[PDB]
Amino acid sequence: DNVTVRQGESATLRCTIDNRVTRVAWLNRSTILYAGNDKWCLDPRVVLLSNTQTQYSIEIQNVDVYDEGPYTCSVQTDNHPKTSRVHLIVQVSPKIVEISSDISINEGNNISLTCIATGRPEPTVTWRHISPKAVGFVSEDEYLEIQGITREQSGDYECSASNDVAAPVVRRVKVTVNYPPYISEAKGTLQCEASAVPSAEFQWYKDDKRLIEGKVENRPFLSKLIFFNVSEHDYGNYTCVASNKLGHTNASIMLF
Amino acid sequence: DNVTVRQGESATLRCTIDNRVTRVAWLNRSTILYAGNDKWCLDPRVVLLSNTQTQYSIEIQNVDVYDEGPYTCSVQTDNHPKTSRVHLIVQVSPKIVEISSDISINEGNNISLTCIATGRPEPTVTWRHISPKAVGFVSEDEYLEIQGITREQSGDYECSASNDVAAPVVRRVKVTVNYPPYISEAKGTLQCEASAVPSAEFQWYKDDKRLIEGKVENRPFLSKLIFFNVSEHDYGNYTCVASNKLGHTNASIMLF
Ligand SMILES: *[C@@H]1O[C@H](CO)[C@@H](O[C@@H]2O[C@H](CO)[C@@H](O[C@@H]3O[C@H](CO)[C@@H](O)[C@H](O)[C@@H]3O)[C@H](O)[C@H]2NC(C)=O)[C@H](O)[C@H]1NC(C)=O
Ligand SMILES: *[C@@H]1O[C@H](CO)[C@@H](O[C@@H]2O[C@H](CO)[C@@H](O[C@@H]3O[C@H](CO)[C@@H](O)[C@H](O)[C@@H]3O)[C@H](O)[C@H]2NC(C)=O)[C@H](O)[C@H]1NC(C)=O
Ligand SMILES: [Cl-]
Ligand SMILES: [Cl-]
Ligand SMILES: [Cl-]
Ligand SMILES: [Cl-]
Ligand SMILES: [Cl-]
Ligand SMILES: [Cl-]
Ligand SMILES: [Cl-]
Ligand SMILES: [Cl-]
Ligand SMILES: [Cl-]
Ligand SMILES: [Cl-]
Ligand SMILES: [Cl-]
Ligand SMILES: [Cl-]
Ligand SMILES: [Cl-]
Ligand SMILES: [Cl-]
Ligand SMILES: [Cl-]
Ligand SMILES: [Cl-]
């Protein structure tokens, strides 16, 4: 009375008959598939497997989703019309179709992500935070909304669509939270270290001079000011400056 | 005067001579490699490439690290002994040999991880936290030590050894920070949700009954108590209990 296949597989529909039966046919909601051994429908996927005195069965190959529905087996038995039906159920692997693109905001702003997934049954969609601190799910919905976002809430967020039709599927969104720089380290060959998003752009100063080379070894988070010791103007109070889209800060360093 | 090869490659040592030269030889710190065309050493890796009036060169195949050192070319020129030397330098890809195994402590305890890496030059070793909040490195040393560890400090820590000899190499340690459960959600079919490390073990109660089935749908972080509505003893004050190695907590839930 129920038969379930996955999209693309073949569905075999069976009907039990006996020696009281004089006519038999399969129908797809008034579209004749088979009347006896005669194929009425033009659907090339539909074939006949058996027509004995006990069983009358067909097969729908390469099953689609439109095929889902009731299929009717009509007979003429003892001059009594009789009807037996089967319900073809079609399943589809879950898939994420449209998911919010990568996003970059400033600390304190809001976000709203959407993960649109399809499948049969309609899939369960959940969001998860890719972070060591995370436990369970951030959202058990097709939506994820965060207000007053903080640096610790940045990182990847993973959508996951599931309906037990074979594998569950995922697809990630990267959330970047921007914030002005702050100094991580500063001491005196001579280096300072700053953390920022976007990455810090470093610039050194001495008595407000920019100190152009020939008259620095930089990283996205670290800047070294290197020079030979015990030399001309070997004075302290160098100022490390970390610049960024959202602001700037600094710290002064001595030598001896 | 200097020649550098990677371990396993071949090192070609050259010497420039002229028509004043009457003798010539290559030596490995008093071990004769070649005297003219005569191979004295038994090392099968050492071959002769040229012996013209202008150049005298050999080749050390499948170079090892013990081979590193000075190699001497002796000659007899104008009856004057002359000596020219070359320094073979051997490089080795960086490798992490021993790294602290995975570790699991309680929130507030200490850890100390060590990453022992080898290579030529002796590699630069750094630690990095695999977390969205991380910027730069946790430690620029072969050691990483954390006291009063917190949940947000858990997760993977990556060692990275580098010396620019081809690829840098990494190898991770997983730090798990245990903490007693706390309730994330509780409301009323009827479910509660708790976060813990190790994962929470759930148990429901009603007027101190344990409510054995036949007389619950559980997850490592979530527990559902399911039953038909509008029925016998359809009362509230169900108590969700989250148990763990390190403690336990609970919360009560109503129905209507
Ligand atoms: C059982 O009967 C139903 C209805 O009598 C059959 O359904 C029809 O199947 C076709 C193809 O499988 C569907 O067609 C297409 O239309 C869409 C636009 O809607 C178009 O984008 C496609 O390219 C294609 O042309 C049609 O919509 C669908 N109709 C209904 C009402 O579901 C079904 O195929 C029959 N089963 C078997 C096994 O023959
Ligand atoms: C240039 O001369 C030096 C020294 O005269 C040669 O060094 C020696 O090389 C051998 C093999 O390359 C080394 O041997 C081994 O000993 C270790 C234990 O230390 C053992 O575990 C190994 O299985 C192997 O038996 C030896 O230690 C090393 N000696 C020194 C002082 O470095 C070098 O090979 C010469 N170069 C060429 C190209 O012939
Ligand atoms: Cl997908
Ligand atoms: Cl922005
Ligand atoms: Cl993960
Ligand atoms: Cl992805
Ligand atoms: Cl960030
Ligand atoms: Cl910091
Ligand atoms: Cl950065
Ligand atoms: Cl910037
Ligand atoms: Cl390695
Ligand atoms: Cl423990
Ligand atoms: Cl990473
Ligand atoms: Cl690893
Ligand atoms: Cl943890
Ligand atoms: Cl929480
Ligand atoms: Cl858990
Ligand atoms: Cl436990």
Side-chain angles (χ1 to χ4, degrees), chain A residues 22-122:
Chain A
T22 62
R23 294 284 192 273
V24 63
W26 276 107
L27 306 82
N28 181 6
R29 290 160 274 176
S30 82
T31 301
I32 303 170
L33 310 180
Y34 269 84
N37 303 333
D38 291 300
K39 189 179 178 189
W40 193 81
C41 69
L42 296 171
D43 191 325
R45 301 176 295 153
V46 184
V47 306
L48 186 64
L49 295 177
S50 67
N51 186 5
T52 75
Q53 296 180 336
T54 65
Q55 181 178 274
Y56 186 66
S57 66
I58 58 173
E59 173 178 300
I60 307 164
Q61 304 182 330
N62 183 27
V63 166
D64 209 317
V65 300
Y66 302 93
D67 306 350
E68 184 177 84
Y71 287 85
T72 307
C73 186
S74 295
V75 297
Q76 304 274 267
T77 304
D78 293 330
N79 288 331
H80 301 287
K82 292 183 185 289
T83 299
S84 179
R85 288 189 168 85
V86 64
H87 307 79
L88 178 67
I89 301 166
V90 180
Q91 294 179 326
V92 176
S93 64
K95 178 169 181 176
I96 300 166
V97 184
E98 300 185 5
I99 191 166
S100 289
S101 62
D102 285 354
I103 186 167
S104 181
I105 68 192
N106 296 331
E107 196 171 33
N109 291 350
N110 306 331
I111 66 168
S112 175
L113 310 177
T114 304
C115 178
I116 301 165
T118 67
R120 305 178 83 83
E122 189 180 3

Side-chain angles (χ1 to χ4, degrees), chain B:
Chain B
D1 301 337
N2 289 281
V3 58
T4 305
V5 299
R6 291 193 51 197
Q7 181 180 60
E9 298 185 296
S10 298
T12 292
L13 312 184
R14 290 184 174 84
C15 175
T16 301
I17 53 178
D18 60 20
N19 281 327
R20 304 178 295 145
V21 176
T22 62
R23 294 284 192 273
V24 63
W26 276 107
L27 306 82
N28 181 6
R29 290 160 274 176
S30 82
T31 301
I32 303 170
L33 310 180
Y34 269 84
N37 303 333
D38 291 300
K39 189 179 178 189
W40 193 81
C41 69
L42 296 171
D43 191 325
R45 301 176 295 153
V46 184
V47 306
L48 186 64
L49 295 177
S50 67
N51 186 5
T52 75
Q53 296 180 336
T54 65
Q55 181 178 274
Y56 186 66
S57 66
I58 58 173
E59 173 178 300
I60 307 164
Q61 304 182 330
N62 183 27
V63 166
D64 209 317
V65 300
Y66 302 93
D67 306 350
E68 184 177 84
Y71 287 85
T72 307
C73 186
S74 295
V75 297
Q76 304 274 267
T77 304
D78 293 330
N79 288 331
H80 301 287
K82 292 183 185 289
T83 299
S84 179
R85 288 189 168 85
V86 64
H87 307 79
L88 178 67
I89 301 166
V90 180
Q91 294 179 326
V92 176
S93 64
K95 178 169 181 176
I96 300 166
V97 184
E98 300 185 5
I99 191 166
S100 289
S101 62
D102 285 354
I103 186 167
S104 181
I105 68 192
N106 296 331
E107 196 171 33
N109 291 350
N110 306 331
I111 66 168
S112 175
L113 310 177
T114 304
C115 178
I116 301 165
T118 67
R120 305 178 83 83
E122 189 180 3
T124 299
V125 177
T126 65
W127 283 94
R128 183 170 68 93
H129 190 207
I130 309 299
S131 167
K133 183 169 165 176
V135 173
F137 298 95
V138 171
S139 176
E140 301 174 355
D141 209 320
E142 296 177 356
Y143 301 83
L144 178 156
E145 301 180 5
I146 292 173
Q147 298 93 43
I149 198 165
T150 58
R151 173 178 167 189
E152 61 181 335
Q153 289 171 297
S154 75
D156 285 1
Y157 287 85
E158 178 172 277
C159 175
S160 178
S162 180
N163 56 14
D164 288 321
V165 182
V169 305
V170 306
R171 194 161 152 186
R172 292 183 177 192
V173 181
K174 184 180 298 302
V175 179
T176 300
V177 174
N178 302 288
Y179 59 88
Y182 72 91
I183 297 302
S184 303
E185 186 181 76
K187 59 185 182 183
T189 297
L190 186 67
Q191 70 179 41
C192 62
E193 199 169 333
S195 297
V197 177
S199 286
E201 295 181 2
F202 289 86
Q203 179 68 57
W204 290 78
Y205 293 84
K206 170 70 171 72
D207 289 345
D208 295 317
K209 302 177 182 181
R210 283 192 68 196
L211 306 175
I212 297 303
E213 284 88 355
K215 301 184 181 183
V216 171
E217 182 173 353
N218 279 346
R219 306 284 186 273
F221 71 99
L222 167 64
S223 181
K224 297 185 181 184
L225 180 56
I226 307 301
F227 52 95
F228 176 67
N229 64 34
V230 189
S231 187
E232 284 189 356
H233 300 291
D234 200 17
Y235 295 111
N237 282 310
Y238 298 96
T239 301
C240 166
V241 175
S243 300
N244 195 9
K245 172 183 172 181
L246 297 177
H248 61 281
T249 190
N250 59 50
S252 294
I253 308 171
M254 307 300 287
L255 299 183
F256 292 88

Side-chain angles (χ1 to χ4, degrees), chain A residues 148-179:
Chain A
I149 198 165
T150 58
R151 173 178 167 189
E152 61 181 335
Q153 289 171 297
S154 75
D156 285 1
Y157 287 85
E158 178 172 277
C159 175
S160 178
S162 180
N163 56 14
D164 288 321
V165 182
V169 305
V170 306
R171 194 161 152 186
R172 292 183 177 192
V173 181
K174 184 180 298 302
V175 179
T176 300
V177 174
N178 302 288
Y179 59 88

Side-chain angles (χ1 to χ4, degrees), chain A residues 7-28:
Chain A
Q7 181 180 60
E9 298 185 296
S10 298
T12 292
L13 312 184
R14 290 184 174 84
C15 175
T16 301
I17 53 178
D18 60 20
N19 281 327
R20 304 178 295 145
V21 176
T22 62
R23 294 284 192 273
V24 63
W26 276 107
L27 306 82
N28 181 6

